[PDB]
């Protein structure tokens, strides 16, 4: 018995806030959170407590500390089969990572529609507001390996496996509404250009290098998603605070056989929020697991990630009514033209038990659809359909990857397919072919119908010659980038310009930077000029004279394309650093902590060392982390309570904490003599918007602080931060 | 033609300093740098210029921009074999990464001994000072994935493949002279404990988590290598500036059959140097590829990494003469007891062409020895011999991994082994077995002898019963950690305290922190007290009374265990940041660059934007990076030349660049009016050792700066940095 006698090794099996208890496998942390998929995994869940340690063949091991040798200082013997089994399993633990989105974090949850959608689709999982469908969702970055950092600038994946009663449906989306390229034949080129360069394998998790911008400069179709990635969309605060999109136009098919075109959306109920670049980049060093950690801890705290599924629906007869082609995945459908109709809610409420078994081995593929859905001729979607089945043959070791437990349907599956590596199902059917008489032709085909019918493809008319040709309706590259640019606030536009400027500064061949700037001048001259000024490049008179691309269907902006133009803040689940001193005003700390708790905001008590400090009144304050150990990068706001401020006033870490939080536009609140830190951040005596200050933490101090947190960051501080040495 | 007309897309094929040209594949950057192994890869090197783009079956492609479809807006057709080949190859690009040391950076080079070693070994590669052996070297971290960062705190691997005339010898070592564990049976336990925890797969590239410290606390044999990892050895400045060690005692066998015990060492001819923790951690975010990049760029510059191979030799009759067991890999052999004899020099002088083909697929294994070497019964080495052949069957896809080009011997290899996946060699032998008469028994066994003989194991006597038992002589755990502690300078000791304090602050379960401090009390009470104080732990009276462990064979210290106690600085290949302004004094820059060039130190010119600035005399200066884009983390020292200092005096990033460099103990040199930056880092008028200042940058100013850079960091400044907010 090596556990502490007080039982403190084991986290409580109840919701607890971030940092309050060690994290644990979901079935131990939250044994009563169930759904039909979680329950179906019980056949493979393995416990440990009270069991003997064995080999994989069930033989009990007596001494798991030593190899078998001839003499206690002698050579290891070949006959040690316990050693060799254990080292062999170790030696073959790794499987190939995903070719793209190798870095990702996943959770289980459930989805339910708000009302039946039978009028527009026969998909069973959308047929009844009381039908609950379990989900497994993985969120990811794109470029970096499985061991890369989370808060890089990149697109994010947002992949949802719906375990429906009529089959698995995987909605395999990203967090921006378009992709970089038009036709899947170019996917290896694009991916190779953004991935680490092939001679030296640098850089990891960064588009900031020559080959990515070379390809962008040569393929202007890429510019629209490049605009999104260079905005603060590329650096989300959390997977809970980003949008999701299926990108492609798909079809819904109802029981009468009518097709409606659809694009899929996820709206985050926590709101949209992103980091700023300097914070994101520094956070990749201070905590490369920050998004993975934040998702796991939100679920352990009960701050369940919630998202609303929504559809943009366009009738078949309106296919050609826009200035862009609906089948072109580099174009978005502005919500001002086609609104998102709310469909249902997804809540992620339990972590996995074992990351490798459930996250690493999960296989999502957008070809996994169900009756009631269908594809379109989008030429990027069409090639995706080939890739996601083919890649699993190496990644997951063969054609039986649907028998890996996380991938299994919860509905029935029966067919004539047999064998393959790793075959788990032992088929008893006398027949392995159809048509057969020897088993009365079972299992049997099922005609299509309104419910529980076979899959039949929508009978779309095809007419044309066999060509490798891009549709001319796809040959427009700048109007969507411009619509995105004009829809952003002034501070978002600044962050875009700073994104392009920072990334192009890392491109060693200057002509590439020049070619990118020339493309920017086809989108918007103000953008192009601002980036050029940061790169020391002067636009030519020709460039100054490029006419801007047209409006998109009459629109000159669409505010739903901005993260921040329309307030959607939610403070629940956010966190505040509280910088302690060795004699904290206890009345301040009571008021601060209860106000935060009332709004579901978490706190971390920080000091210059671990252990405890004692408040003016004798209250013992346990310390969560030191100032350097939990930097301001990891919090949303900073509060400094009154007390003995001299204890920390000359602490360089405490001062720099406030300087970093101030640079990154975070709300900062200072009570009583903590206002002596105004000099560290150069705040005027009469104060400034974004800094809460008062004689004590009472009255409206915490409400003012919370109001600032609901607006996420103090954008008005931006011109004040250039001078700050931080 | 898409290339620029000026040819500026292609780097010069001559040695160039870091940043001067885009980096390139080895064979294009240094086509005239050759060795027998590099030449032998010519059968598989493939160029590209002037060749048509084809499928892998050699069919020319006309249109590599589009899939084949039925009409230009129609569905993709299954008969598009060009698209499916291209996407199939992409879909199967990844192979499993190495179970441990998945993150590593490699280069080609050559070794030669200083004199023949035939008196102590018959190994051919050590027989003649003028017989050169090609090598391929891979340096690595241990815990993190292939996409993790370089400048983590961790042990580093240092693996050298020697392509000898009598077979491949792989010397598969680390940068510390011992390992964490004694018997290979525990390796999966220890690796699992240090790797990301299994529920949530956090943390990447960090031992700072509960499971690793839980295992440490329960297995005191780990503490010696834990001391090394928590010292600045854990955060080297470059792979050029760390030591290498084979760890285990092996044998040398001479022609007369005499066995000598040997432990292997690499001495870096660039000297020993490490980062400091705050700089290393922030560097993992600002450039997670810093060591990979620095190695590739040093080779491109001609700053070839050089290492001296060294042997500690112990006669067979002296096996039991020390107070530790020579076969225990948690024990080092102090160089005060047994000196390192210099054996030869290895120079790494060409980077690979393709990182995946040559680095990712290289297989090193310490069981690849040659005649003249042999193993010992060290129980960690004994089990390593099983693992490195086993693991390549999944990582490299089967038993023909020696036919992957980088792994091929350059000497002859012929045997009766056949088939296996991706069999390259087509054997013409009518026989695939021996003994055979049908091929007159070829290829034939060869008796052992003085040179070119068959391998025979040294006939060590084995006497003992079949037991799984640890030798009692291995059961001592604190004397080597203590010798290490006592051998460090006071600043190195402070860094060890800080590393333990930082790491244990991240362990959520307090009793684990407590148990590790109790282990530290068994090593040294001053260490244990200093760590306990940072964790808010008070040692008990019993802990204060633990008797220190014995000296190691009478030693109270061995200064060879310190990075810094004996000077061995070499400035060649280091880099300085020069912070420009828009009217630089050309006379300063002349003097600066002259003095740097004389000592082989590179410069990077930084400014507040990219493009160019013009100096006082009209010299146009191209800017390498912005102050934010290439932070002080990435350089060894900072120079600020005179000129229009008002241009940059209030620039936040320029002032922060100096505060960060100052915190991290780097030399800083300020010329003329640049001395106004003294205020930012609170230097008094009379100046401070470590800050060079004069009216202009002259010979004297540069000599002083260069002398500082030879001492690597300004340790005496440590007391002054606690108060700097940076
Ligand atoms: C033709 C190839 C191809 C193209 C054009 C795309 N992808 Fe893809 N995608 C892959 C081929 C691929 C892949 C090779 O099949 C991956 C990696 C391994 C896997 O299981 O699937 C994958 C993984 C993958 C994942 C991670 C799923 C997971 O968590 O395991 C997401 C979220 C996306 N992709 C999303 C997209 C979106 C939104 C695209 C454009 C609209 C896109 N993919 C285009
Ligand atoms: C019994 C298992 C075992 C044990 C006890 C060790 N290793 Fe090991 N090592 C492996 C099993 C392994 C491995 C699983 O076989 C690896 C990874 C995959 C590969 O090709 O080899 C490996 C890789 C590996 C590499 C990377 C080689 C490369 O760059 O590809 C280095 C430098 C070391 N090890 C060094 C050590 C040292 C110095 C050890 C202690 C003295 C040690 N290993 C103990």
Swiss-Prot record, chains A, B:
Annotated active site: 101, 174
InterPro entries, A to Z: Catalase, Catalase_AS, Catalase_clade2, Catalase_clade2_helical, Catalase_core, Catalase_haem_BS, Catalase_immune_responsive, Catalase_large_C
Primary location class: cytoplasm
Catalytic activity as recorded in UniProt: 2 H2O2 = O2 + 2 H2O
Compartments it resides in: Cytoplasm
EC number(s) on file: 1.11.1.6
PROSITE patterns: CATALASE_1, CATALASE_2, CATALASE_3
One of the record's GO molecular function terms: heme binding
GO biological process, one term: hydrogen peroxide catabolic process
Cofactor(s) it depends on: heme
Cross-link (3'-histidyl-3-tyrosine (His-Tyr)): 365-388
A GO CC term attached to the entry: cytoplasm
NCBIfam families: PRK11249.1
Subunit comment: Homotetramer.
Function: Decomposes hydrogen peroxide into water and oxygen; serves to protect cells from the toxic effects of hydrogen peroxide.
Entry's family note: Belongs to the catalase family. HPII subfamily.
Protein name (database record): Catalase HPII
Gene name in the database record: katE
